[PDB]
Amino acid sequence: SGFRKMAFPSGKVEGCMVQVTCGTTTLNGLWLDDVVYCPRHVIPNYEDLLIRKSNHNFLVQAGNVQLRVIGHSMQNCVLKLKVDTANPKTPKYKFVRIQPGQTFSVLACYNGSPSGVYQCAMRPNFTIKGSFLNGSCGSVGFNIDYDCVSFCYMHHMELPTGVHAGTDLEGNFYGPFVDRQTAQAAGTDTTITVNVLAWLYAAVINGDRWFLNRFTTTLNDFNLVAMKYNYEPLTQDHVDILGPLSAQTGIAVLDMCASLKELLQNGMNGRTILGSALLEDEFTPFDVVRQCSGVTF
């Protein structure tokens, strides 16, 4: 029993974190094989700024060891520093781009030293509600599938509302953001409907049923209601994905949608669900199945 915001074990990623210094700027890098990946802003016309730099301008520290930079290249908003030593702690890994609504673990780092791990979701507006201070750039987001680490996010900046923006490990930003100090703002955000539904199924599994009712709804009527409360539309793909949890609890997805509709229209009435007075949207259907089954890495 119990339901916590759970992150993946971070050990395989901790063994990849390094410190990258160029001039006065210090940030974090990800050392995989013989390459260190980091935000290109560590050096704007980035090609013009990069051409002036030489390998010895980049100081890379792995623990108490200075790595030697033997080459450098830029891929989108990510700088790739070729080093003379392959990371002996390189795990089995992939670079994956995630979609809004998907969750991942963030290993927050400062000066190449991991300080904390938390779980979060890529918001529908492509920002993440992270917890980052100055020095956190280059911190990474990841998931683990069996023994393979899938790197999905690299931290680049904080927006004026306190939310965060970054790229995949190929340097493509999530959202309409640029890596420059200029007027940028997070767009209006929405609630991840399929995730709220997964979390309501997790509450039922844990013995919380007060919000269940005898009613059902059509997908179209639910989406008309959901659009009124700034909730993302629920697709047939989401309904299919929630199939296993529906079969386990005996509550059809559209039956749970009628519970969600009543919660949006009437509120919680002083009650909580899994210790929360708000509808939680940062657990995917897969996270609920994993945490209520005990999958190991």
Place this chain on the structure above:
Amino acid sequence: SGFRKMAFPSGKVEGCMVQVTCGTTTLNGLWLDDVVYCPRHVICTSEDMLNPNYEDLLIRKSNHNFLVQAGNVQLRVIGHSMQNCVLKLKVDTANPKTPKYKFVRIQPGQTFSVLACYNGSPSGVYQCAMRPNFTIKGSFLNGSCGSVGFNIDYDCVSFCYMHHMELPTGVHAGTDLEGNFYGPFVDRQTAQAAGTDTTITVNVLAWLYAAVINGDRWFLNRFTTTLNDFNLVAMKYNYEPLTQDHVDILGPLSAQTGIAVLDMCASLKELLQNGMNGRTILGSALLEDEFTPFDVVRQCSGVTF
């Protein structure tokens, strides 16, 4: 900016997790140097659990009855001893991944990271607090016994909790790494229940200071309170008494934000009376009590917004 429930990086603890099997029971162990620490109830059957005589059950066991597996390697048990509710299995190999560590016993209100494990394999990490009633609101399934709670103090791992059981309300009970239980619990399947729980007042105050540091002040008021009047109101909402030690501990956050502890106490009294009126504080519609004053200082900026 931002405020998340943050756990310590778990790598130093992952390299210590092993699987311990004795007969039909399998659970997790913590391998440090040449010793594997695990709950002593690994020697029990489900029947034994009502009134087990651990000393009588242990004397009947030999070293080769305990199977210890570290990854895909079988460790050889060369000795065994019981210390309170933990079993200590001496092995023939020191753990090469043993970090710098200490065994610390924590007090209610203290927070720590839990590395939940099954079959000696880590599955997840979460942050939690030792409740005033000595239970933890964890997320544990069968096979999670032996999973540990810890903090990482610079580069040193302080082990503070080892998981032993789940109470009927779904909450969890365990011991420190010397085998002493937190709370009036026993490693017996007898009728046991968590006592009435309360809110960790000093932690809610720390979290209100974190909200001010992050730029939110909607909940402050022009009032102050005496410590005694605050405690009289707090007890009525099932909040733990606030002591002079708690007021002293909140000193640094009071100096950083410019808000006196008893003024922040007056703001808490008003929140308990009015609720939030559709507003949130750091993304929460409830008053959060699982961040200590130390966690707030560690996570938040040193410059108030």
